[PDB]
Symmetry: T
Subunit: 64 residues, 12 copies
């Protein structure tokens, strides 16, 4: 059985690095992370000093 | 990193109050709740005594 | 077996009351109405004297 | 010919009042506003003192 | 309030049995599981000895 | 001209048998049923004694 | 209250004439037909002597 | 950089002529119109003397 | 078994004729073409001397 | 690099067997078939003697 | 009230730089740009000397 | 007439380089490749030694 958690990673550099930021977080607390699906991408502009790229992913991990 | 949980709130009064019911629940157990996105709305009729409005939201919270 | 009919209710007050307007109509002529799913919402402005909220629902009812 | 502008209204009270907030703004600067279609709804929580309901609409107006 | 978890069940027999595999898992660790919605189906071919049917479901459970 | 009716069939056995349950019902009361399109599938768990598979179909029939 | 019926019109000439074929049928049996929304278009090739254009519409009519 | 404006053209003749009606309007006031994408089509019936075909397009134009 | 190929036809006259242009091409090289589904429509303006209507179709054909 | 082909399998028994019918066909002529994604399901009723279940899949295979 | 404009940025380097190209343009002529949502990405190949990455964004800005 | 093939490119570096990997492959065997549309992006984690970015594109090419 796989389960997915819906995480948004951020990066001041690129959409790929923002996807890695969410995946790194999932791998800090979950075992058996096996793939991630990008579901949304965007850029935060008016709440930050530098534009921040955001990449939202479903991160799938195999249970037990 | 943000994470989202997918909750359906209910209200006998309105779709806005059913969204607040899910958000209130998220805020009882999570810290740093920052926004919610409505993904579905509906009305339960044939299992209740009063119509019950349901509003399903992804509730986003900032991790650590 | 459930069947659904696709109805748009209207209200000069709110999207929740426009959903109830469609459901009230379904319950006037159908038996065993059991739930409704909101599929669209909008506001009529330039054909009315007061803005009219419209909420389109699939209204499900159990057959026999 | 109709044209649409994509506006997000806000309200501390309800999703219906947030739709009216966008429509009121369109009617301040455009003539012949004729209908609005709701395309998204959400709630801002972690950047405000009171939850703020947001309702995003395409607001259609007839040209000339 | 309902919450949903996004699980993918697997079966070497059918898409219905792969949906039951995810639901069985949810029922091992959650109380008050009340319904599941199928969101995706697929077949793993080139990483297994027998084709494996996969059925991804949102499994809803009532909170407290 | 074809018309479609939106029916949800149920089965305690499989998603295919739940699609046949809706189609059987359409064929009891309509003539010239010609095809059905699956639009949604789900499983009722917390209102029944046995899980019930549900398959929602648009059932098309040729008019006159 | 508006209700919609889901009809597919056909024409050997064009997608516009196939939409009119469904609307003509709705107007033969319903009163107060007020608008139609195109939801799908296609062409039947291998079951006919001439290609047949098909245009599927939700045809809305005002109730009473 | 391209920008798009969302326009609905109308015609009493066909969906193609209603798309041209929106594009003609865009070309009256914008320079460098380069392509249009159809996003919706429908037919106004109960507010007109003749059916009016409507074709909604995103009309893209190159900026400067 | 059916297979589909994804083709975009073009016409300087109409969206129906652009769908026929893709279907004519499929029928020049494939046997047993049985139906086509329209998936997208658009108009090329800024790369041509006359507007060119484009209609993208999945063209289905029965295998062997 | 993976490529996908869009095939519809058929079965008089079930949606799972109709998915296997498309996959079996892909495996007769392609090497390195690695997974399939279900994209649509339906039932042919009015052109056959027995209902025929149809399951449309994108069948992915690794190139070289 | 927020308004969004739909812009496509281009870059010969990456999808992230093409998103920044649209955002830079919006910030040259609008005040209070606050976030952008990616809605589409693609690559122009056969009209250019170098591949050009294109990233289409809704760029939101707060009104007054 | 344009035709599209559905390819998934991979890269250990970025989503842009994974899109180029699919396009490079299409250009090795097809003539007149003219544009590609991104339809999906994801990251393979649990079957590789380094994360692999995957970008799925419809690659369009002009026929003859
Ligand atoms: C992708 C993205 C989306 C956002 N959407 C909203 C929104 O709807 N409302 C708001 O107040 N702020 C928003 N902020 C947003 C920030 C980002 C990066
Ligand atoms: C929105 C809504 C959706 C529902 N959908 C179903 C369904 O598919 N099947 C069922 O037995 N009950 C259902 N009950 C539903 C109740 C509500 C409120
Ligand atoms: C939601 C909504 C949508 C509408 N869409 C259209 C349309 O496409 N064309 C038209 O003439 N009038 C329209 N009127 C509309 C009125 C409402 C309330
Ligand atoms: C609906 C809604 C959506 C939002 N989405 C985002 C987002 O993606 N990222 C962010 O930093 N803030 C966001 N803020 C958001 C605020 C609201 C109200
Ligand atoms: C449904 C399904 C989808 C898959 N999608 C991918 C994919 O995008 N990339 C990959 O390396 N493997 C994949 N493997 C997949 C396996 C299954 C069963
Ligand atoms: C598919 C499925 C969906 C349902 N959705 C809901 C829902 O939204 N709310 C509710 O009270 N019960 C629901 N019951 C549902 C039952 C089934 C089988
Ligand atoms: C639009 C269109 C769609 C069709 N889809 C199918 C299908 O899935 N299966 C089948 O046997 N025949 C089909 N016939 C079709 C005919 C037309 C015109
Ligand atoms: C496409 C089309 C859509 C429309 N939708 C609506 C609607 O939702 N409500 C209404 O009062 N009138 C409507 N009028 C409509 C007119 C057209 C042509
Ligand atoms: C429908 C249509 C879509 C197009 N989309 C694009 C695009 O994204 N970028 C571009 O450079 N040219 C484009 N050209 C387009 C031409 C047509 C006809
Ligand atoms: C799924 C399915 C879809 C179909 N759709 C159509 C259609 O649009 N028009 C038609 O003449 N026959 C059709 N036949 C169809 C047959 C099947 C099985
Ligand atoms: C994303 C993208 C999409 C395009 N779509 C089309 C199209 O439909 N037709 C055309 O003539 N050119 C097109 N050109 C396109 C160029 C790009 C970059
Ligand atoms: C995007 C992506 C999607 C995938 N989806 C699946 C899946 O559904 N099932 C599976 O066994 N492996 C999968 N593997 C996947 C690998 C990637 C990269
Ligand atoms: Cl989710
Ligand atoms: Cl419907
Ligand atoms: Cl838009
Ligand atoms: Cl495809
Ligand atoms: Mg930096
Ligand atoms: Mg988002
Ligand atoms: Mg009360
Ligand atoms: Mg729901
Ligand atoms: Mg009042
Ligand atoms: Mg509507
Ligand atoms: Mg207040
Ligand atoms: Mg939004
Ligand atoms: Mg076995
Ligand atoms: Mg999946
Ligand atoms: Mg049994
Ligand atoms: Mg459903
Ligand atoms: Mg003729
Ligand atoms: Mg169809
Ligand atoms: Mg005339
Ligand atoms: Mg519309
Ligand atoms: Mg000519
Ligand atoms: Mg297209
Ligand atoms: Mg048999
Ligand atoms: Mg289909
Ligand atoms: Mg360079
Ligand atoms: Mg695009
Ligand atoms: Mg490296
Ligand atoms: Mg994919
Ligand atoms: Na989730
Ligand atoms: Na219907
Ligand atoms: Na717009
Ligand atoms: Na394809």
């Amino acid at each position: 059985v796989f389960k997915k958690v819906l995480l948004t990673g951020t990066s001041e550099e690129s959409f790929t690095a923002a996807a890695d930021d969410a995946i790194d977080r999932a791998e800090d607390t979950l075992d058996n992370v096996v793939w991630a699906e990008v579901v949304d991408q965007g850029v935060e502009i008016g709440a930050v000093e530098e534009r921040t790229y955001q990449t939202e992913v479903q991160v799938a991990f195999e249970l037990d």
